[PDB]
Design a protein around this ligand. Structure first.
Ligand SMILES: N#Cc1ccc(-c2cccc3ncnn23)cc1
Ligand SMILES: [Fe+2]
Length: 215
């Protein structure tokens, strides 16, 4: 007896108030089992064929790739991105005073899970990114056995959030200092896709994390 929520309804009746109140918003069953397993297979195919780069080489002074959405074998990742963009479009105007004029490409990541991430802020220095969006791909993830919980500590609140990296879960949170977060050790392989959305004013006033594409 079940139906998908129209994006406008999901954005305005849930995402906007959740974000404005808590700065964090979880949406389960975002795309359904079929589209989600297709994304998983595409992500796993990229990994098996050796298209990922060591993530420690990116950050220094996990394994990742950046997906635009139109590449061969990434069609459904492109659809995920379109569906995310639609939600943000229906929100835009009402997520704080942000006006979102773009986003990064999709960061597709494999986290091997062998006791691997410390508390950090995604955007500490006003790099322009205002909303972090993560989509998880781990079928039948059991956190008791496997770990890998994202813990978020909203700043100046007497509460925190424990987000399992669950299949077909879409997560939004403010990328700035409001949401320091850590990832507890994991003991199985994980896949996720992260996109960051840009506020126009902060972006204009400021690698691949600094590349704004249109929605
Ligand atoms: N599944 C899964 C999965 C695991 C770890 C992270 C990860 C790594 C490093 C920093 C960071 N910040 C927020 N998530 N996250 C993201 C997704
Ligand atoms: Fe993070």
């Amino acid at each position: 007896q079940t139906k998908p929520l129209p994006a406008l309804k999901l954005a305005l009746e849930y995402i906007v108030p959740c974000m404005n109140k808590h700065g964090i918003c979880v949406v389960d069953d975002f795309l359904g089992k079929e589209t989600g397993q297709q994304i998983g297979d595409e992500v796993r195919a990229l990994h098996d064929t050796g298209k990922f780069t060591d993530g420690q080489l990116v950050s220094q002074k996990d394994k990742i790739t950046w997906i635009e959405g139109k590449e061969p074998g990434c069609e459904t990742i492109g659809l995920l991105m379109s569906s995310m963009d639609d939600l943000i479009r229906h929100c835009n105007g009402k997520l704080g005073s942000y006006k979102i004029n773009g986003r990064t490409k999709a960061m597709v990541a494999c986290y091997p899970g062998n006791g691997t991430y410390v508390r950090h802020v995604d955007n500490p220095n006003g790099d322009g990114r205002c909303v972090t969006c993560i989509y998880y791909l781990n079928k039948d993830w059991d956190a008791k056995v496997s770990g890998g919980i994202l813990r978020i500590f909203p700043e100046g609140k007497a509460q925190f959030a424990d987000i399992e990296p669950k299949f077909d879960r879409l997560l939004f949170f403010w990328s700035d200092r409001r949401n320091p977060h850590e990832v507890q050790p994991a003991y199985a392989t994980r896949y996720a896709i992260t996109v960051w959305y840009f506020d126009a004013d902060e972006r204009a006033r400021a690698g691949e994390k600094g590349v704004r594409v249109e929605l």
